[PDB]
Amino acid sequence: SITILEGLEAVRKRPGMYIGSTGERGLHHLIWEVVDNAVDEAMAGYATTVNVVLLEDGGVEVADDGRGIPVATHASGIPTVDVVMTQLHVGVSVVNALSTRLEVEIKRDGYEWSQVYEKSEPLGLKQGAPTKKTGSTVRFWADPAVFETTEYDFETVARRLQEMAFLNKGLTINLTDERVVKSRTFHYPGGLVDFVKHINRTKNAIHSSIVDFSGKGTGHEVEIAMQWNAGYSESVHTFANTINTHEGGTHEEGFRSALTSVVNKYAKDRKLLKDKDPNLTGDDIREGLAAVISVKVSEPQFEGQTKTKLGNTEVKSFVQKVCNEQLTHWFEANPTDAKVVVNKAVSSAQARIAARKAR
Ligand SMILES: Nc1ncnc2c1ncn2[C@@H]1O[C@H](COP(=O)(O)OP(=O)(O)CP(=O)(O)O)[C@@H](O)[C@H]1O
């Protein structure tokens, strides 16, 4: 009588529940799912190059030079690729459910492997030529029965790929469109500094020396870069495992609480703010601040309706202790720059009082 919808069947029935929408956002989610999976290699230290190709037929190719996708037989008894590609827990399997076809070309374990999924169903793993080379290529063709549009937007892809490249300084991402060949290449050796530079271009940076520092702990790693501009508002970009957390969370909060205390204490020693005067607020310190906070968490939990909010309690305290130590170093290290960004803080506090008094 009743029908229970499990696995990939559910995804097809309510794709939006998993992807977002059956519109542009959802369509591009297929790419995000796959490219993410590739970049996770580059992040771990195995991939160096990730190539995205928008094929003429409307397919997408995503090739990396990581360790490949395990082909070896899984605990289930079916090859590990098949598990990844046909079973939930989001993750790339969803791409399979929502494509008419998915083709995987692997090089692991001394040869070339090829597996095809026709309407999510595996057609049988094939072993080819021997090779000492390692990595994976994924091809998928979005199902038009699912999506309102199947046309990918070059520029939306390019923007995301660009930021993935800032977050990973060892990585090179090549985007190429075979429709309408138009190509873009993203590699930033400066990493998060090249990111800050990018942000503060149109804005006039207040000080020349850009803040760059790192921290490593238990199941987490952080990397921060910041530079103030003549701006009246902040531009702080936060990331957890290359995922852009617009909602922000514990990594951003640890950073804020550290920066707020570092600036205030520094000001007191320099006598920049009158001891009698109340401590500068979080808002006045970040007035015109451009920053990037990129954490690497081993097991990350996200909260918020968006699911773009890092919730790891463990991380708030970690980022805080890292900033407290390294920002104190950068302040004392650059007394020139410190004097400017503090005065900017003072100006930001005086501007709020000026609006209050008159009128
Ligand atoms: N190109 C690649 N190189 C190496 N391993 C890959 C890979 N593509 C897939 N995998 C393997 O399969 C998994 C991808 O499955 P899935 O997308 O469900 O999980 P995930 O670890 O990517 C996080 P999420 O499910 O949130 O996307 C990876 O965790 C990895 O173990």
Ligand SMILES: [Mg+2]
């Ligand atoms: Mg995934």
